[model samples]
Target: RAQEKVLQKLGKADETKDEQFEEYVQNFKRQEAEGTRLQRELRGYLAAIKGMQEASMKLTESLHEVYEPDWYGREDVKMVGEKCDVLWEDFHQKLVDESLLTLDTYLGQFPDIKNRIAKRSRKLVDYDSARHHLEALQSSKRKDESRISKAEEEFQKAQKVFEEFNVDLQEELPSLWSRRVGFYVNTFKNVSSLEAKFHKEIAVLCHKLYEVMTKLGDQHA
Candidate 1:
């Protein structure tokens, strides 16, 4: 609030604006918001997997309780059940350790950079205030040379500080924007690959289950 007063009180020429940097900030915010949303969805995806795993385990437990002693493929049913439990556990663990972790690491860069962006803006405000303060005095009727020199020094120091942050953001922000493609591709690519493989192996187990259950005569009928 106090920082903005300089711009508001001065000739209102406005702070030194950069359209390109503003656009970069806009793009960065968009990416951050979308990535955060994706992380949540990914988390929900893992939850769904866990739910399915528990459901499958419960079904297996029910089957074991009701399984007839002399049924065909009785041993195979137990094996299939164990295998399915292991498969779901393994799949869930890998996603957590690898895919989710990768996405987390990718998203982690954003908060630090966002703070840096904010710091850069604050520094720019300082720089603008210093410059405008000096300008308002120099252009006024009282032209105090000593005061002008002192203000000149302050402006120079503020400018240097602002430029340091500005330069880093200029290079970093756009590069980060460009790298989103690779992160998105790799994140989804690894997840999808694991997904397909998990389902394919589960399909075989499902087929085996079907065969074994069909061989058991319908006791209720």
Candidate 2:
């Protein structure tokens, strides 16, 4: 494979060229890089969610401890901490199940296709070397009939092997590339919907705490 590649680079063998296939490959790389970035950011978002839960719980717990025994809405403050914990846990879980999992499963298919694409490129090198070898042998001033015959057979076999991988990849790469459109749209749609609902649910709980805080402040005043 290395020698075949070198031959092509040295112009001893002609490399196969397909503009549309090249564009499809470019699209695949771009899509792969984009998916990785999303996955990394999604992982960070999960960490942030977990960190927010810890901070929120700590703040509520510390407030509950500082409140005097005769203070207004003491039990209410305790209940708020418990409720907020549940809400934060449920929100984090849903984000993982719906958004993070969806992103991961979609990206999982990429590595296999990437391997196939690389293998196809290797096969192309093999095919080109075989073809060039055959041509060089036939063009020789003193041709060995046995060597020429063997070279022709090798060329035919190499071409068939290369085409099997090439044809499949040409079809599959475009399919993977186009599907990213729908996948991306739905991924964000699920994430946005879940995020909106999480904020709405948490806001109601926060509002209750706000009322409790207001009454406590008035009682002291």
Candidate 3:
């Protein structure tokens, strides 16, 4: 059976086998795996964003604690910290809305389709089992027409159910596999572009804070 499956995969057999469609299935599997990994990494990236936000807030709070109210640019320092918090919040929210949320929705589709495929496989097995039982009954000397008819009905039902799912997957899997390319491109583009914008804006805040610190230092001098 395994050897036949290998032959089927290699296009050496044609009966009830679709090598090309199976290749598409393989592509779909790979695409799903890639999407899952990307989703995981994106989640981790979001966690890191939160971690950095907390650390930044702590650092700012520490500075606020030590910096005397008499310090020059005290209000500037406070405003910078507020602006930094806002920037971090904006960055995190943008990523959740634009990238991570999208990833979640994209990956959400695979579970249903995957379950359908497994069900189809089980139905095929049931069909095959019923077919073999019917054949065995026909070969027996005490064949029962009613029993054979019931088995045939069951076999047909199983075949119909399996074929329905199979046909749908035959139509959908290739399309879904192809869509991965665009999905991946868009997801990464959103992430990278948003990151660039966030960094650029945060750099401006950092520079402003630097200037405030410089003024404080000059006052101390």
Candidate 4:
């Protein structure tokens, strides 16, 4: 009975009656499947990249927070290094362990069989390289500590004022720094456009998938 219903639906998906509808529906399904597959693949990539980014931000934030002119006069300013030291260690370790090196080792194995996929893969390779270095600058522990420590003090003072506020400072700090990294990476040899195109394709695929699912739902109802 289910098989018969499946066949009926498939047979009724004709070109002449709802030509654009049918074509779009079919195209939507194809793109939707591809998009879903790509999304799953990208989750891993995003996670790896984020880990690297966080590490970089830690160092940058550390220095930025600790060394502001306003902080110089405060008695509490002396405690900045001790307070930020633990966080610095953890972030440094994360930078060393995760990031482009890890991604490269993994992606290096997959030889692109198709020309388009190969081209896209190369863009990813470049993105990873650029992202890694940006993070690397942030990850350096030496100079940035004072600034970050001061920032931490300011964040704490804010949290004290708003007791209910549970702020993840590390997450917030890196966003500003990472954008600069992205700009540099994107500007390198038209790589930005390539990455943008890749994103556009993914967006199209997602929309197509959504339409297909909507149509399938309406048909059933």
Candidate 5:
């Protein structure tokens, strides 16, 4: 009875035992291994892609908040510029925060992942550098913004003075009075110089903006 059972099993096995069976088994194992490798690779790739996309979205939102004011001369231009400076500073600070958070998260699971720790250290350095630069820019912008405010006030005051001269003093003055002549000349020069100073400050601010943008490019790259 045992011999009969063995012969029955052998006949059944022979029905499927051929080169095709070997090829199928080989192909199944090969495909299974490849699938596992692909899944692992895909997980890492997806994580990286998602992180970058989130970073970009955050940066865009911050930038929009920063530049909400009108482009040219406007009351809120300095305010907007300061907002932009703060936004970039916050972004870099967040990078540093995330870098540390990642390290903590991974250390909980894999305490021996030294490479990951090293990578976090490198990221911390990059974030620190970026933050330092951003802070410097913000400080400089603040100083310039203060100067711009002062210049704006001076211009307004000078305009008021000129108007007062036109309406109250110029109308009652003698045409050939040398003192009035000298006063008009001095007023013109002072107003011209103040206006030039305001324009120059704006130009300098634009240049500073360009410089910050260039630094961002270099650091991000």
Candidate 6:
């Protein structure tokens, strides 16, 4: 039975084993852990973006308050402030839609798979216990046919249930594990590309603002 094979594997009862498969499982665990850490850090990056938006807005608003209507580049300053707000909003929205949402979807697959893996482990234990009970009954000096029959049935049922989950996980885990590489590459690529674009655009706005400030300073002199 499938459960018997699992027990044999666990007990080192099998003469031949797939060492490569075990290595894959180890790699899968590392990938899952790395994904979790990346998700946590990505959330922190979003929070920092939000904080910077607020701080930059406050600083821009301060400039608007200090500037008089008669000052040169007064209108230019107002336009620059509006542009800054728009840039931040665009950057945040793009990140949420393109990068953060993708990251969220990727991580979402983990909880269900993890839960099923746990369930499979529990079922495996049940199968092992049932198998042991059947063996004990078979070894007894005075065997009860009826009890033996019942134990055999239980063992079969346990084996079937455990194997169903085991097979599913055996298929799914590797596929999921393999996906982490591409997912990480795409997610970070999106983030880094967007960040570069945002900063490049913002730098242009900052330069324009600086030019207006210099003109205002000359007028004051």
lDDT of 1 by residue, 3-115 (tens): 45553554243333456789999999999999999999999999999999999999988888787787677788888999999999999998998889999999999999999
Question: How are the candidates ranked when ordered by lDDT, highest leading?
Answer: 2, 1, 6, 3, 5, 4
Off by over 4 Å in 2: 1-17, 137-148
lDDT, model 1? 0.85
lDDT of 2 by residue, 63-90 (tens): 9999999999999999999998998999
Candidate 4 weakest ten by summed lDDT? 164-173
Error of 6 at 22 (Å): 7.7
Better of 2 and 6 by TM-score: 2
TM of each candidate vs. truth:
0.86, 0.84, 0.79, 0.20, 0.26, 0.81
Give the higher-TM-score candidate: 1 or 2. Answer: 1
Tens digit of per-residue lDDT, candidate 4, span 60-166: 45555665454332233233333434344443344334433343433332232123233433443443343333334335555476665554455444434332211
Backbone clashes, candidate 1: 0
Clashing pairs in 1: none
The per-residue C-alpha lDDT of model 3 at residue 159 equals 61
Name the lDDT value of residue 138 in candidate 1: 67
Q: Distance (Å) between predicted and true CA of 85, model 3?
A: 0.5
Instruction: Give candidate 2's TM-score.
Output: 0.84
Cα displacement (angstroms), candidate 5, residue 133, comes to 86
lDDT of 5 by residue, 9-126 (tens): 5334433432333344354344345434534553454466456546745754565456434333233344436544454444444433443333333223323333433443354344
Q: Determine the C-alpha RMSD for candidate 4 after optimal superposition of all C-alphas.
A: 36.5
1 or 3, which is superior by TM-score?
1
Q: Which 10-residue window of candidate 3 scores lowest in summed lDDT?
A: 6-15
RMSD per candidate (Å) reads 5.4, 5.4, 5.6, 36.5, 43.1, 4.0
Cα displacement (Å) at residue 111, model 2: 2.0
Model 6 per-residue lDDT tens digits across residues 1-221: 23355544543531122344356568767877887888888889888998898899899889989988879997888888889888888888888898789988887887887788778768877987888887777777896999999998998899799878877877887898878779988998999999999999999999999999999999999
Off by over 4 Å in 4: 1-15, 18-20, 54-221
